[PDB]
Amino acid sequence: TLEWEEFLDPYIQAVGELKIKLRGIRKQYRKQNKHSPIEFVTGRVKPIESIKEKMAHDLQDIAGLRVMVQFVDDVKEVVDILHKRQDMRIIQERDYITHRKASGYRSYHVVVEYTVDTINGAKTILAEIQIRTLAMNFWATIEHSLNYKYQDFPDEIKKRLEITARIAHQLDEEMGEIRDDIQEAQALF
Amino acid sequence: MTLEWEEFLDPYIQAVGELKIKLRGIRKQYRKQNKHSPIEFVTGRVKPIESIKEKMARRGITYATLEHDLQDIAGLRVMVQFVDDVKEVVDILHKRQDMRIIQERDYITHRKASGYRSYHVVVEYTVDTINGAKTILAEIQIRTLAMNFWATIEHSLNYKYQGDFPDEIKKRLEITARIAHQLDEEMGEIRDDIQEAQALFDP
């Protein structure tokens, strides 16, 4: 409706601004000839339907951003950059990378207050920035679509999704190790 | 166009990019609320290095004070329908918490001798940068289309003639400055009627 359109305006504006802003971190690393910790960024406003069920703001993810990085070690590099930012205040961090969810989902969550300027004045909202690897984004994107297309998965499907997440993670670890073993195979001998 | 010039200008390129999008989002916000936007067009530029160097030579600015003394390395142009819309845009800027308005210059009320009309708002704007927050000066000018048409043309001619216009060109600059003011004054006379009509339907 129009009432929901009005309530979500500031979250829609914030996702827009934060996408541009987080994408510009990457451009800043490349322009100064350095590895960008950030590969790409996406975001959306929670669809009306998903919001409605989940309430008894402290609904943290109405505005959601997804920051993809190549390696697990890049995650902390991005969290530090977010700490140095003057346009947001970090309210909450959750390390679901070191400690995964039961489904297999892995991600680092940073919840921020973000203020948006409107013609009706400043509006401060919460936004959730999810940092994850390419491998975790591969898994989460597919898991998310299969879910949205289903409804709750049979147990056997849920297990198979868990297994593919487990292997996607071993892949991140191994790619982390290849990167290390390259630079080590130059740095120490 | 060196490495040190590139490192210096980046925050300004970044700031112009953000401010263009933010100024256009104002226009978009009005329209989303089914209101007509005072702002029609938004433009911006980072001053070219050789214009920066010129302005340093002519004002006595050194490299050390450059970021403090030169107000319009980042420059934005906001085009409005009516002279009386200028104050409405200025109001929206004062309301913003992402900038601090440090100086305003009213060359509409205090029109220059040449015929130049514009309104300048100089702001402090902070950009977030992988090397940390960086505060810059940006200059937002607010103009009608007729003010913009005359000014951009006078500026171009003035790059060539620097105050010394051929008699023919000056005569024309002066009549067009009068005609352009008159365009805005005549239209201003029925601004209330036009705006009332605009509130009825925005395509």
Ligand SMILES: [Cl-]
């Ligand atoms: Cl535009």
